[PDB]
Design a protein around this ligand. Structure first.
Ligand code: PU3
Length: 210
């Protein structure tokens, strides 16, 4: 049971801009996604000081970065707060609306794409490198879900009955033909060092078996 939804026009326009614009400093996708993960981890950590049962779905607070050259994927797995069905379909796009507008206005007027994160739309920097993005997520108050979009103006949301993640978020970046450098841990390690060296959660960089 796949449900298909249209993005708001502005977010479809943001996505096209990110896909079509000539912009070589693509590696900032990684910083933004790790930051979203850190935020999510901050959130479940904070909530659990007043409700320690919020960790019954997992005590470890961590981020894993897993390259896979033959699937052509880069996965970022966190054990943060995760996302509900409502976030995926309605809530997150509602917040993103204003962020997308301010950002667009800032690009016009000569800000650049690396500044995307200051407007709360950093997630979409994934499309700098990924042809398709799949998000597996699990919040304590909800079922596990699979969110998916290859842009083109749509996303899908379905109940995911694959392996439980317990709590948190799996971002699977299906990378573009020309973006395979990010399937290498030596390249990923370099990008983590320049941008994300002080994240206050253990970031394990997996190694290709390849
Ligand atoms: C921007 C608010 C944060 C939403 N979010 C994000 C970024 C995000 C941002 C979204 O729109 C701005 C979005 O809807 C398309 C989304 O869904 C897949 C994700 N990553 C995480 C994460 N790893 N864990 C918990 N929440 C997250």
């Amino acid at each position: 049971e796949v449900e298909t939804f249209a993005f708001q026009a502005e977010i479809a326009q943001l996505m096209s801009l990110i896909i079509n614009t000539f912009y070589s400093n693509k590696e900032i996708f990684l910083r933004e996604l790790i930051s979203n993960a850190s935020d999510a981890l901050d959130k479940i950590r904070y909530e659990s000081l007043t409700d320690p049962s919020k960790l019954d779905s997992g005590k470890e607070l961590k981020i894993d970065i897993i390259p896979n050259p033959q699937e052509r994927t880069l996965t970022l797995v966190d054990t943060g707060i995760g996302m509900t069905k409502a976030d995926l379909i309605n809530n997150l796009g509602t917040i993103a609306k204003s962020g997308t507008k301010a950002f667009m206005e800032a690009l016009q007027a000569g800000a650049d794409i690396s500044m995307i994160g200051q407007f709360g739309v950093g997630f979409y920097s994934a499309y700098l490198v990924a042809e398709k993005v799949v998000v597996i997520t699990k919040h304590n108050d909800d079922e596990q879900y699979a969110w998916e979009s290859s842009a083109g103006g749509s996303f899908t949301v379905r109940a995911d009955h694959g392996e439980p993640i317990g709590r948190g978020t799996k971002v699977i970046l299906h990378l573009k033909e020309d973006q395979t450098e990010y399937l290498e841990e030596r390249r990923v390690k370099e990008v983590v060092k320049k941008h994300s060296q002080f994240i206050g959660y253990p970031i394990t960089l997996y190694l290709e078996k390849e």
